[PDB]
Amino acid sequence: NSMATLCLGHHAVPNGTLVKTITDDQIEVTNATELVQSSSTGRICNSPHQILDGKNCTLIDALLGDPHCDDFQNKEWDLFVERSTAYSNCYPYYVPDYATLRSLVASSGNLEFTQESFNWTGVAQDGSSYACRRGSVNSFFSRLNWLYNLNYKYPEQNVTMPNNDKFDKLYIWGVHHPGTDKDQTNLYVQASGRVIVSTKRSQQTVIPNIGSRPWVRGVSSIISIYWTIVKPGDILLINSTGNLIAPRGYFKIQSGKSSIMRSDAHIDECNSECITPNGSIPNDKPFQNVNKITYGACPRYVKQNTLKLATGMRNVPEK
Amino acid sequence: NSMATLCLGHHAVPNGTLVKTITDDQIEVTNATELVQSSSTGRICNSPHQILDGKNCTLIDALLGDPHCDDFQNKEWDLFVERSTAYSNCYPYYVPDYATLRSLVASSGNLEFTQESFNWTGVAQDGSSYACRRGSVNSFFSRLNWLYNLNYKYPEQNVTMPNNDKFDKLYIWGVHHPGTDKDQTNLYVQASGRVIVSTKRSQQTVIPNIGSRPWVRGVSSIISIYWTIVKPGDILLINSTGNLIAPRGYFKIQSGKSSIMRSDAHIDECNSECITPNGSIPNDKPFQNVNKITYGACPRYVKQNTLKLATGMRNVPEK
Amino acid sequence: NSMATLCLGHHAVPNGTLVKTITDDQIEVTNATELVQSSSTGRICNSPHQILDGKNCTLIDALLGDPHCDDFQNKEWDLFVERSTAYSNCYPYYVPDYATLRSLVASSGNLEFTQESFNWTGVAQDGSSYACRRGSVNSFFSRLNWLYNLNYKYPEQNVTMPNNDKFDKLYIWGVHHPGTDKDQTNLYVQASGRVIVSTKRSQQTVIPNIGSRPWVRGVSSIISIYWTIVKPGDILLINSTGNLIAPRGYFKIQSGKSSIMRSDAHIDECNSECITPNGSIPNDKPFQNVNKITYGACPRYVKQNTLKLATGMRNVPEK
Amino acid sequence: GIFGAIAGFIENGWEGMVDGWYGFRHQNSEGTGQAADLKSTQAAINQITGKLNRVIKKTNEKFHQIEKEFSEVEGRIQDLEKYVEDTKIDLWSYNAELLVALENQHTIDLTDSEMSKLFERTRRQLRENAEDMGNGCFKIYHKCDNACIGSIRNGTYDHDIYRNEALNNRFQ
Amino acid sequence: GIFGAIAGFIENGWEGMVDGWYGFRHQNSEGTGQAADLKSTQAAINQITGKLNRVIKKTNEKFHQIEKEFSEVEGRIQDLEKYVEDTKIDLWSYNAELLVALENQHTIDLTDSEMSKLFERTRRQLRENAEDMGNGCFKIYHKCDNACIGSIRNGTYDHDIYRNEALNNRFQ
Amino acid sequence: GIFGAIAGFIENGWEGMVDGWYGFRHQNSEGTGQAADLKSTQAAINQITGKLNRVIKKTNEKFHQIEKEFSEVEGRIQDLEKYVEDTKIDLWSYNAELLVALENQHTIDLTDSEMSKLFERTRRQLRENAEDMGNGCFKIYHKCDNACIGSIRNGTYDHDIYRNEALNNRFQ
Ligand SMILES: *[C@@H]1O[C@H](CO)[C@@H](O[C@@H]2O[C@H](CO)[C@@H](O[C@H]3O[C@H](CO[C@H]4O[C@H](CO[C@H]5O[C@H](CO)[C@@H](O)[C@H](O)[C@@H]5O)[C@@H](O)[C@H](O)[C@@H]4O)[C@@H](O)[C@H](O[C@H]4O[C@H](CO)[C@@H](O)[C@H](O)[C@@H]4O[C@H]4O[C@H](CO)[C@@H](O)[C@H](O)[C@@H]4O)[C@@H]3O)[C@H](O)[C@H]2NC(C)=O)[C@H](O)[C@H]1NC(C)=O
Ligand SMILES: *[C@@H]1O[C@H](CO)[C@@H](O[C@@H]2O[C@H](CO)[C@@H](O[C@H]3O[C@H](CO[C@H]4O[C@H](CO)[C@@H](O)[C@H](O)[C@@H]4O)[C@@H](O)[C@H](O[C@H]4O[C@H](CO)[C@@H](O)[C@H](O)[C@@H]4O[C@H]4O[C@H](CO)[C@@H](O)[C@H](O)[C@@H]4O)[C@@H]3O)[C@H](O)[C@H]2NC(C)=O)[C@H](O)[C@H]1NC(C)=O
Ligand SMILES: CC(=O)N[C@H]1[C@H](O[C@H]2[C@@H](O)[C@@H](CO)O[C@@H](O[C@H]3[C@H](O)[C@@H](O)[C@H](O)O[C@@H]3CO)[C@@H]2O)O[C@H](CO)[C@@H](O[C@@H]2O[C@H](CO[C@]3(C(=O)O)C[C@H](O)[C@@H](NC(C)=O)[C@H]([C@H](O)[C@H](O)CO)O3)[C@H](O)[C@H](O)[C@H]2O)[C@@H]1O
Ligand SMILES: CC(=O)N[C@H]1[C@H](O[C@H]2[C@@H](O)[C@@H](CO)O[C@@H](O[C@H]3[C@H](O)[C@@H](O)[C@H](O)O[C@@H]3CO)[C@@H]2O)O[C@H](CO)[C@@H](O[C@@H]2O[C@H](CO[C@]3(C(=O)O)C[C@H](O)[C@@H](NC(C)=O)[C@H]([C@H](O)[C@H](O)CO)O3)[C@H](O)[C@H](O)[C@H]2O)[C@@H]1O
Ligand SMILES: *[C@@H]1O[C@H](CO)[C@@H](O[C@@H]2O[C@H](CO)[C@@H](O[C@@H]3O[C@H](CO[C@H]4O[C@H](CO)[C@@H](O)[C@H](O)[C@@H]4O)[C@@H](O)[C@H](O[C@H]4O[C@H](CO)[C@@H](O)[C@H](O)[C@@H]4O)[C@@H]3O)[C@H](O)[C@H]2NC(C)=O)[C@H](O)[C@H]1NC(C)=O
Ligand SMILES: *[C@@H]1O[C@H](CO)[C@@H](O[C@@H]2O[C@H](CO)[C@@H](O[C@@H]3O[C@H](CO)[C@@H](O)[C@H](O[C@H]4O[C@H](CO)[C@@H](O)[C@H](O)[C@@H]4O)[C@@H]3O)[C@H](O)[C@H]2NC(C)=O)[C@H](O)[C@H]1NC(C)=O
Ligand SMILES: *[C@@H]1O[C@H](CO)[C@@H](O[C@@H]2O[C@H](CO)[C@@H](O[C@@H]3O[C@H](CO)[C@@H](O)[C@H](O[C@H]4O[C@H](CO)[C@@H](O)[C@H](O)[C@@H]4O)[C@@H]3O)[C@H](O)[C@H]2NC(C)=O)[C@H](O)[C@H]1NC(C)=O
Ligand SMILES: *[C@@H]1O[C@H](CO)[C@@H](O[C@@H]2O[C@H](CO)[C@@H](O[C@@H]3O[C@H](CO[C@H]4O[C@H](CO)[C@@H](O)[C@H](O)[C@@H]4O)[C@@H](O)[C@H](O)[C@@H]3O)[C@H](O)[C@H]2NC(C)=O)[C@H](O)[C@H]1NC(C)=O
Ligand SMILES: *[C@@H]1O[C@H](CO)[C@@H](O[C@@H]2O[C@H](CO)[C@@H](O)[C@H](O)[C@H]2NC(C)=O)[C@H](O)[C@H]1NC(C)=O
Ligand SMILES: *[C@@H]1O[C@H](CO)[C@@H](O)[C@H](O)[C@H]1NC(C)=O
Ligand SMILES: *[C@@H]1O[C@H](CO)[C@@H](O)[C@H](O)[C@H]1NC(C)=O
Ligand SMILES: *[C@@H]1O[C@H](CO)[C@@H](O)[C@H](O)[C@H]1NC(C)=O
């Protein structure tokens, strides 16, 4: 010859993948990586977040002190997990802003309770019921105090409780709506009257309303549930003619990174920073298609189930 | 010499449109397409979406059964259109969270009503009035049953109505507020009363409010409107001393693509996927500038009234 | 020797800046400009936006007419500035929708008040209290009229006040909740009062709750504050058998660029379109890391504190 | 033009070429003429159609949403409802502005690329029988009748049979 | 691609090359060989790894948020909660779809670049001792044993040594 | 850069050039030249100024909004107000991050482009009178005084004035 020939080229592969670009929406490159997490194991990992399985207990039931929720006293969590099998097994209750209370308690992230003695005078304390048995024995919500007549007298109550500590106190109280006029008098002797719970910034008034409610667990009555926050240097102040389901103390209002989630996924011993109701998912990808409900360092939820990012050149095979 | 010349070039047009780029604010290309729909015809097309023109009626008026809205009974819609000229012409009323009742009925998409027999004993039914004239004579909301004294006596009413079907039920009821103490006794015999409507999941209590009002269309009084959803297996429980505007049955609540819109645009014989209060607009372009209120397969509302996308090369004349 | 040489090249600098790209996280270019405004003088410029320094008065207190807030009467603003050192010095009060009332008044942007003569009959007016002193002299909110009994009598008031102007009217009124059953009868002779405030589209009814409230400036009562808007053609209608804190007139309610901001920054004499609680900031950059709370023509808040936009080529020096 | 061919070393385009986007003009013994190039015209058109269909794709279908106009002053809840829709509109208005700007910048640059790619194809084909004049044209140093031109416009120009005629005309 | 080399004037790739992304193939009288180019392969990998690292990373760490499923009809506030989350999901789904399209378009275009860059780097080395054949291969006009083809891949090829032999074989 | 000129076949930049972004350094019998090229410098500056003005266009003008800081616990309605503002900030933070990354990538690639366009502008002018030495420099094969060099920068270089002198030295 006295001649040589030098050819330049690029590599190719047999398998290849399709990705989308600005111009084509299916074009073949040598290699791509998935950007959308679309699968979970089905199990929540109990590290590195304090997970608290509520089992048969709702966060509201545990807050009030339902007897079968006794194991949740003074408990704290990063993520509280409510199960669809949860039930209530105490006195019938109702919460006007149930979602708000559930939210603020979940965000606070603990049930650490501090006892307080309020000084009720002239009334019987520690009322119980056939519908809230702690051992076939009658009892009540562990964190509420049912006030009723004492030797067939019920004097009007006036009570203060100052917040001299340095944080915010959360009080949970209630009002009793008996089913019959005669049940009203056998309990509080007087006809229905008011409950006025106030602070220097909050103002709440409940008027008991006697009436037949749906029979639940042996009774046709219902308790309404209300909440009050007391700032430092402020004062909680209760004035009630009767029908008062009194608080036994206060919860601490922390403010952290805790929340609540509805799931039935089992809890393993594993490690992943992201939690979804469908279980834990890895966060090595920037997007996910598992669930829009997430907690932790999670990929961002998107509608696509696959987004292939090209990690190689165009694949042009041979003939 | 034996020459030849071979010139490579591109086409151009005497025409040119200006487009926007990363680098230049106006630069001329050979051709571009508009991406922003900015004009409407002014008319709503009657297909593909099942429009229901409310004309002189509002959805709530048709829901309750205002006599001049009787033709809306058991009507179904994809998009209900409310008109600014609508008016009320029955007994005076107000709805707390009016916007909510309107929203949940509008997204339900129908007014299919189903009668139910409530065991009301000792009480007269079918209370009438003028200011709600159903042609000359006196009558009431077609879906509401006004209960009043029977021989100047009003026994306290306590009736139940369970849900044994596979769907949610919507109950609309009311509470009468007479304008004088005498009116309260002339209708229900007793003084100020109580109305208690309950399910296993909800709890609703209204205390009537006797005292005067702006007398509307001839009467001293007004009605408050409430709703109650009863899920399958649950129970409706009504107990009232009086002042109860009882329901006559339930509405079937559905979930679907139904909604409501305020517009005075005329309805036309044509087809168009996207509906705005200005009338229908084409949806061949990705964005639109007509109205942020839309219904259907619509372009996304944006602030710009034009965005030209280049579909050709740079245009370079040729003087 | 027939030689020559011609080298092409580009400039460099001895000190480049680092910027981010799609592929490299940090790469050196000859020059860049910052896009995130991260600093501020710490002072609010009083131009071109009409600023109003709230001193020790919150907007609500200036609305009602707290004695130490009378210098705020009939003032306009584009931006009202509430200070953290504000205090209340009149009768203790409570606004059920405090955020809402604060929002709508701030958006209206003025406190232009107009006297109207309501025809109160058979009652004393201009009631005062020790809790709201003007000097050592007892007085009250300047925009509210405290009605009480005259000669052991409180006739049921009924007043009409029609809006015949061309603008909307904002009426502010209240309901007095006395601390004891005797305070009630001393002031309003009736055991329990009532207050109805109506337009042709509104029904606000309040029954006062008698009960002890937190001791404030020698007073254990409180005042609920309510507001009502009357459009042209509409009428304002009030009936009361007791406990009415009556309005003295209306506020003109405009709509426009007015708002409110909480800040403790001082107000210098300069010009700046963008305002933040940390002070005014220049708006030449598209983004700012100072504060998510902004007023006026501001950059958009982002989480990043520096974003370098390259304004030169790659900087490639030698060694 | 990132590639410097359209509005670059090609002084202007041809309003007289209505059968394609890119093409050849020639001058020889038999005369002058002009023919569009189908391959590079189809390449550019296909890329521009492909990106146009992705922009127009159109998945956005909403039904019952929040209210967006209000006749009454309500305050807090209404402030939030307006703030939500305003935030949504500003965010989509940004997306639409940036999309058009990026796409148009890419449409200018890719049509510039095709022109340059066609010029390099032609240069590689001519080998040593032609010289770049710097304006988009080639000096062809040998006799090139219509069939020879028609053979350059198309991938079948055998430079080896003209090399000796061309190399002598280049060097003297 | 915008540079016209991959799926361009290179008609296809080499499944037989496994030690690199871009490389060489030659033929002497000594026989044929193959070798990858480390420099261009590294340049492309480091850019793609760099953009891959920009894409896959924190932060989106959220803790207590709004409720997104509802067992009850509630009306106004729930409509707003649904609308907010629906708005957020559409916007991110758009951001994700657009990001991949831009990145993949640029990934494809920068790999085409490095192929074209290796070709021009080689063309400058060979000066007047080789001719572009148009298909990615050069024709070297002088006997080159495995030593000098390895000095081309290497960047040690000195062209003054073969200029006399090459210019003669080119010009007849 | 995608065009492999800056940080590519040109080994580094000139810290000694301050009156222009791109320029010519030359050498001949009267040594010592350096001059900046205004046309290419102007082109890169116009585009960079053009995009810099697009990004600081300054449209956001908001007045009465929602409250974004809260001193009391309010639960559900407040969760939503925080979620709305949080969602909005993350989306603009993403837009800002992506905007900078795209513009800076494009700025590098367009400045690298202008360098390459100037090289191809110079290469076409010189025709057969020079050769690419590989480091962004041409070896000119004829006597070229400072006037002759200036004609290359002014775009007034007549190549066949020197074609016979140049082709001699090239092939001898
Ligand atoms: C239902 O239950 C509630 C509470 O359980 C009852 O409300 C209570 O009512 C009483 C009577 O009105 C009221 O008592 C005095 O309160 C203020 C408080 O002043 C400062 O003190 C508080 C508390 O810190 C104190 O704590 C320890 C122990 O508790 C004390 O020993 C310390 O000294 C602390 O002060 C603190 O937060 C602030 O620093 C308060 O500023 C007080 O001002 C009044 O005292 C007056 O009492 C006499 C009235 O004439 C008089 O003799 C006093 O000298 C004083 O005021 C005089 O001073 C002026 C000169 O400066 C004179 O010119 C003037 O004429 C006046 O005479 C209050 O009397 C409680 O605060 C209050 N509690 C609450 C929580 O509201 C309620 O009544 C009950 N219901 C019914 C129907 O009875
Ligand atoms: C206003 O209107 C409402 C609606 O009607 C009305 O509410 C009704 O109140 C009654 C009375 O409390 C209540 O009656 C029964 O409720 C229970 C339903 O239970 C279910 O489960 C049973 C087993 O699965 C099943 O057989 C039932 O058919 C039903 O499916 C039911 O448990 C109650 O059971 C007691 O009934 C009598 C009570 O004397 C006894 O015969 C029974 O044995 C049983 O319990 C007795 O024995 C236990 C031993 O364990 C003992 O501890 C206890 O003290 C008790 O004496 C009732 O039969 C209706 O359910 C309820 N209706 C509803 C909720 O819709 C109001 O009462 C009305 N208002 C006024 C003022 O009248
Ligand atoms: C307060 C009370 O327990 N009431 C009972 C009621 O008892 C009254 C009744 O015996 C009458 C007639 O003789 O006499 C009253 O006392 C008078 C006294 O004799 C006289 O000396 C004095 O002068 O006057 C007083 C009047 O106050 C009695 O008070 O009997 C009825 C019928 O048995 C009860 O209803 C039934 O309740 C059952 C269980 O209810 C509990 C429960 O488990 O829920 C017991 C709890 O101890 C009680 N709570 C407290 C704090 O005491 C609760 C509570 O009263 C209700 O739950 C409120 O709704 O009830 C059964 O489950 C079913 O619900 C009823 O048939 C009534 O509770
Ligand atoms: C329930 C009723 O009919 N109310 C009427 C009221 O009727 C009472 C009145 O005639 C007095 C006379 O002093 O007698 C009462 O009967 C007594 C009688 O001696 C004896 O039979 C019984 O044993 O003792 C009772 C003691 O009370 C009557 O009950 O008359 C007044 C004055 O005219 C009416 O007010 C006027 O109402 C007008 C609107 O009326 C209707 C209507 O068209 O809306 C008629 C409807 O039939 C009625 N309701 C029902 C359920 O049928 C409604 C409804 O009551 C009101 O709308 C409620 O506001 O009213 C109009 O408003 C006019 O301006 C009023 O003066 C009162 O309605
Ligand atoms: C609380 O404050 C409000 C303030 O407005 C007071 O309400 C105003 O007063 C009365 C209600 O008590 C309203 O006046 C009523 O108008 C009705 C309309 O009647 C029309 O038709 C009649 C023929 O029947 C025409 O002649 C007339 O022009 C009207 O246009 C009447 O139905 C009422 O009259 C009734 O009583 C009289 C006396 O028995 C009978 O003769 C009548 O036939 C009829 O039965 C009455 O005239 C007035 O409109 C109210 N204002 C507003 C703005 O609505 C409350 O009184 C007050 N409450 C207190 C202080 O307790
Ligand atoms: C708020 O807290 C206060 C503090 O406890 C509380 O005050 C109490 O109110 C009741 C009722 O208003 C008072 O009791 C009344 O006292 C009066 C004295 O004038 C009596 O007339 C009443 O008894 C009857 O007297 C006659 C027969 O004895 C009857 O002919 C007559 O009709 C009355 O019915 C009744 O006992 C009590 O004195 C005060 N206590 C104090 C310490 O001031 C108030 O009730 C609370 N409010 C609430 C909870 O809403
Ligand atoms: C919920 O539904 C139930 C079911 O109807 C209903 O219960 C009934 O309420 C009435 C009213 O309280 C009761 O009737 C009482 O019966 C006794 C008999 O011992 C009477 O002595 C009572 O007289 C009272 O009222 C008089 C005034 O007229 C007073 O002067 C007297 O002192 C008494 O206070 C009264 O008539 C009835 O017993 C119950 N139960 C049944 C099975 O009927 C209840 O009212 C509903 N709740 C509501 C509507 O809020
Ligand atoms: C589709 O329907 C939309 C709603 O009907 C239309 O939007 C309207 O477009 C018009 C354009 O002509 C705007 O024009 C005017 O705006 C001002 C209002 O200014 C203020 O006036 C007083 C101040 O004292 C006060 O009442 C308000 O604060 C007003 O803001 C007036 O000159 C007119 O009344 C008219 O409103 C409208 O503002 C605008 N309305 C809305 C709700 O956006 C749209 O134009 C229609 N067509 C198309 C193709 O989009
Ligand atoms: C307060 O109530 C009285 C009595 O109902 C009203 O007096 C009559 O009002 C009606 C309609 O408002 C008029 O048609 C009558 O002319 C009024 N009476 C007379 C004798 O003419 C009074 O108007 C009410 N208060 C206000 C402010 O309107
Ligand atoms: C209807 O209700 C009454 C109570 O008011 C009751 O006595 C009667 O049995 C009920 N009717 C039937 C058919 O059960
Ligand atoms: C490159 O390889 C060739 C032999 O193939 C050798 O001549 C040269 O020295 C090598 N380069 C270096 C830096 O050793
Ligand atoms: C360019 O250079 C040539 C020769 O040096 C000179 O004749 C001509 O006038 C110059 N033109 C400009 C515009 O500098």
Residue numbers in the entry:
A (entry chain C), B (entry chain A), C (entry chain E): 8 to 326
D (entry chain B), E (entry chain D), F (entry chain F): 1 to 172
From the paper:
The trimeric HA protein is critical for facilitating virus entry and infection of host cells and is the major target of neutralizing antibodies. The HA can be divided functionally into three major regions: (1) the receptor-binding subdomain (RBS), (2) the vestigial esterase subdomain located lower down on the HA globular head, and (3) the membrane-proximal stem region that is responsible for the low pH-triggered membrane fusion activity of HA in endosomal compartments. Here, we describe the unique human mAb H3v-47 that mediates very broad neutralization of H3 influenza viruses by binding to an unusual conserved epitope on the side the H3 HA head domain. This antibody mediates inhibition of virus replication using multiple molecular mechanisms including inhibition of virus egress and mediation of ADCC activity.
To further investigate the antibody epitope, we determined the crystal structure of H3v-47 Fab in complex with H3N2 A/Minnesota/11/2010 (Minn2010/H3v) HA, at 3.57 Å resolution. Initial phases were obtained by molecular replacement using high-resolution structures that we also determined for H3v-47 Fab at 2.57 Å resolution and Minn2010/H3v HA-LSTc at 2.90 Å resolution (instead of the apo HA form at 3.15 Å, see below). In Minn2010 H3v/HA, there are only four N-glycosylation sites in the globular head region (at positions 63, 126, 165, and 246). The only two glycosylation sites N63 and N126 in the HA around the near the epitope do not make any contacts in the antibody-antigen interface.
